[PDB]
Amino acid sequence: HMTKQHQTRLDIISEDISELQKNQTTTMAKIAQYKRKLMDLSHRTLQVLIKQEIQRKS
Amino acid sequence: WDRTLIENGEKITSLHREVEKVKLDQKRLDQELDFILSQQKELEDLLSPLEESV
């Protein structure tokens, strides 16, 4: 009869699944931050490529 | 048997979805990750050439 140590283990598993969700939330917020920074870098490099290519023609 | 067998049997199924749900939210997070490492290795490729030239 291990019915008691099964419930303990299920608390532990349920405890960890909670922590998991908390991690998913936070790193959701980090991806969001990094995607916004990436859009700024992408623009700025494009401008440089533009201004830079305008230099060519002349 | 205390009916504790019922609670465990119940938690099992509950925890089952949780993980399955969570495994999904993860798959979606991993996808956001590659798209970044992708557009980013592509931004550094466009810049590496014209850096030591300007």
Next chain:
Amino acid sequence: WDRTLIENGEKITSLHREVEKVKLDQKRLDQELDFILSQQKELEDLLSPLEESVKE
């Protein structure tokens, strides 16, 4: 009465491993954020010089 027990013990070990594996992906995933981060920096340092010689 007993066969049910030995079955839950196995079911619990499954949940236990599914959880362990998901943990590993989060660990890996944060490791990748670190890379992304040290990469956005090098990209920024790499940009300033270029956007300056053109601020004409």
